[PDB]
Amino acid sequence: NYKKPKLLYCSNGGHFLRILPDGTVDGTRDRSDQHIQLQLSAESAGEVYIKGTETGQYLAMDTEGLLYGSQTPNEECLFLERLEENHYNTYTSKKHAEKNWFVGLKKNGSCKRGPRTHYGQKAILFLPLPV
Ligand SMILES: O=S(=O)(O)OC[C@H]1O[C@@](COS(=O)(=O)O)(O[C@H]2O[C@H](COS(=O)(=O)O)[C@@H](OS(=O)(=O)O)[C@H](OS(=O)(=O)O)[C@H]2OS(=O)(=O)O)[C@@H](OS(=O)(=O)O)[C@@H]1OS(=O)(=O)O
């Protein structure tokens, strides 16, 4: 929540989180892709935004539970950051917090849906690395 740009790596299937020019969100194993470089920033304590440096779009979660890219920052773009016991990070949707809907990636690299996520899954665990 912080100063240099980062990558976000998910060890479930070995993919980095990725934000595309058309507004779609997925994951990839190709460490050279320019759409995987991210800039995090802190609202207040334990709350963050996540932006793609190349396109300029913000990460968001919609009413059905899927991830997508937004040109303007809004309430659907805010997330709750947690440093877990095993020392990974998790991100929870603010607007849908009463249901425990997480950001996550499937074994095949496409995005998980909010309603299909739980505490304990490999899919929800992320690790920040330097670009
Ligand atoms: O066809 S299976 O019965 O093998 O199910 C595999 C799919 O289930 C997930 C979770 O999907 S969900 O129901 O929408 O939440 O993974 C779950 O099952 C796999 C298989 O292992 S098992 O011993 O046969 O149950 C487990 O992965 S692993 O430990 O074998 O590496 C998952 O455990 S883990 O969280 O990755 O450690 C297990 O998750 S859970 O405890 O039931 O929540 C899907 O994986 S997912 O993409 O991470 O959501 C599997 O979908 S798949 O693309 O067909 O592989």
From Swiss-Prot:
One Gene Ontology molecular-function label: integrin binding
Annotated keywords: Acetylation, Angiogenesis, Cytoplasm, Developmental protein, Differentiation, Growth factor, Heparin-binding, Mitogen, Nucleus, Phosphoprotein, Secreted
Annotated localization: Secreted; Cytoplasm; Cytoplasm, Cell cortex; Cytoplasm, Cytosol
An individual GO BP term: epithelial cell proliferation
Stated family: Belongs to the heparin-binding growth factors family.
Region (Heparin-binding): 106-122
Quaternary structure annotation from Swiss-Prot or TrEMBL: Monomer. Homodimer. Interacts with FGFR1, FGFR2, FGFR3 and FGFR4. Affinity between fibroblast growth factors (FGFs) and their receptors is increased by heparan sulfate glycosaminoglycans that function as coreceptors. Found in a complex with FGFBP1, FGF1 and FGF2. Interacts with FGFBP1. Part of a Cu(2+)-dependent multiprotein aggregate containing FGF1, S100A13 and SYT1. Interacts with SYT1. Interacts with S100A13. Interacts with LRRC59. Interacts with CSNKA, CSNKB and FIBP. While binding with LRRC59, CSNKA and FIBP seem mutually exclusive, CSNKB and FIBP may cooperatively interact with FGF1.
Main localisation: secreted
Residues annotated for heparin binding in this entry: 12
Function per UniProt: Plays an important role in the regulation of cell survival, cell division, angiogenesis, cell differentiation and cell migration. Functions as a potent mitogen in vitro. Acts as a ligand for FGFR1 and integrins. Binds to FGFR1 in the presence of heparin leading to FGFR1 dimerization and activation via sequential autophosphorylation on tyrosine residues which act as docking sites for interacting proteins, leading to the activation of several signaling cascades. Binds to integrin ITGAV:ITGB3.
Posttranslational modification: In the nucleus, phosphorylated by PKC/PRKCD.
One Gene Ontology cellular component: extracellular matrix
Name of this chain's protein: Fibroblast growth factor 1
